[PDB]
């Protein structure tokens with residue numbers, strides 16, 4: 001009898017798909033891991049469940065607890081969804097530059113939203129949450145950028161899904177970095193198992209903080225937070241690639257139009273990088289996995305579609 | 307090695323989830339089949355692939371073929387997606403009353419759209435397609451309301467998924483009817499296998515054509531086409547239930563807010579019906595499966611969210 005008790009048992013176990021047309025100049029094989037096959041259509045559903053389960057198991061949730069989280073949208077949607085199922089009160093801080101679909105979804109799940117200034121980006125969404133936390137003891141702030149449960153769920157689920165599904169043949173994993181939980185969790189398991197495996201972090205050209213540049217405003221929602229997240233393990237990352245806004249957008253569009261994969265802006269960015277890596281002679285016949293974080297329907301109000 | 311060759315190998319195999327809070331007065335068990343776990347987030351991805359595969363296998367697609375289909379949105383999105391992956395040209399007729407998200411998604415997959423008058427609903431979307439078909443021999447019109455491949459894919463996939471997943475214990479299946487392919491395909495397999503199984507069709511109170519009333523305008527997108535579709539087998543349906551606009555909407559909202567299931571208007575409607583059926587003393591301890599066709603994110607512009 002395969003019936004989930006609730007929506008939290010429905011996270012993960014996402015499919016890999018081979019790219020066929022969006023492969024210009026590739027000498028390696030590129031397969032995309034499709035994270036919109038999650039119950040609220042993003043990779044972050046994984047951490048939304050995981051961070052709350054961790055809290056529950058450590059006895060951190062009280063009857064009057066209010067969940068408070070800084071988000072660029074998807075974690076907020078993930079927590080709002082888990083809170084709907086659980087019966088928890090949930091508040092999100094989020095920059096006002098994020099897609100209007102994120103705002104509407106948050107509300108639709110009965111969560112509450114506080115918009116932070118767009119010039120301050122993710123750093124300022126964090127501050128408002130940390131600032132609200134100290135006004136009232138009822139707040140519990142998971143804090144995805146610091147929470148061990150974030151990369152942990154990726155070890156336990158994402159990494160094993162990638163390993164099993166490629167039958168250990170995976171050679172390189174390309175992934176945009178927001179909190180860096182995805183790339184870190186996957187590298188933690190796969191790199192120990194297969195020390196030849198390599199891990200490429202992707203970040204906006206317009207905000208290249210990991211590459212040692214200064215932060216800046218960009219449309220690549222979900223990544224380029226503007227600081228080095230505590231949760232990322234940079235010792236496991238083998239290469240950083242920065243992607244321009246226009247490339248990220250164009251490739252996002254080609255995936256929809258050439259592959260039938262309607263994905264968000266950060267998935268275009270990860271694929272630009274996966275393609276670049278796949279053109280290197282030394283990677284001929286290797287297997288590359290690019291993580292595609294979410295669905296493009298969340299972006300209709302953005303310039304991805306206009 | 308579990309890697310799909312393309313997006314068409316990723317349809318179906320959707321999860322069942324038990325309803326816990328939205329169960330007021332229920333004496334039967336209600337589990338929802340979650341069709342937004344499809345590659346373009348709706349049940350109709352199943353028929354979008356299936357109808358084109360059938361055409362290909364019968365040699366009906368030529369190099370200059372243009373796919374033309376009447377849709378209220380989701381089949382159109384499904385075909386647009388399959389056409390993106392395949393390299394086909396795809397045109398959709400769709401009433402101008404359908405969510406603006408459907409229009410945008412169609413375009414995003416590189417498909418072309420022709421809007422038909424809202425006062426003529428689905429009947430007029432059909433006419434425009436049949437009218438365009440005869441202007442040019444290049445058009446191929448799958449015609450979901452007549453196509454045998456529509457209920458066939460539901461026998462081969464949806465029905466078996468329901469049977470396997472409930473381990474044959476399913477007693478009643480509740481499903482909104484657009485083309486009626488879902489309910490017909492599922493009933494065709496399950497009812498032969500288990501003759502005690504019962505099948506409830508759901509339609510708008512505002513357009514109760516199957517109940518013997520006259521057609522009318524309604525917000526329950528996807529169902530209540532305004533005529534009896536050729537593809538539906540009414541001999542297999544055991545009961546029709548009509549659902550009011552407000553109930554459909556309210557329950558859609560409660561599923562998001564109480565279950566963490568963000569689903570479209572037609573899923574609210576199917577659940578109103580599934581709940582009504584589950585309150586009947588004679589159904590105490592039975593297992594009811596309600597089909598939840600799509601995700602609520604497609605509806606942000608509608609009154610479901612406002």
Ligand SMILES: Cc1ncc(COP(=O)(O)O)c(CNC(C)C(=O)O)c1O
Nearest residue numbers: 072074075177178179180182222266293
């Ligand atoms: C669409 C999208 N792509 C890529 C990423 C980067 O994922 P990692 O945190 O695992 O590196 C995120 C992160 N989301 C965040 C941070 C949020 O929704 O708050 C995202 O939402």
Ligand SMILES: Cc1ncc(COP(=O)(O)O)c(CNC(C)C(=O)O)c1O
Nearest residue numbers: 378380381483484485486488528572599
């Ligand atoms: C959201 C939604 N719910 C319920 C239904 C009814 O499904 P059946 O055709 O299997 O009865 C549909 C049908 N869609 C159609 C018809 C379309 O998108 O053109 C739908 O899109």
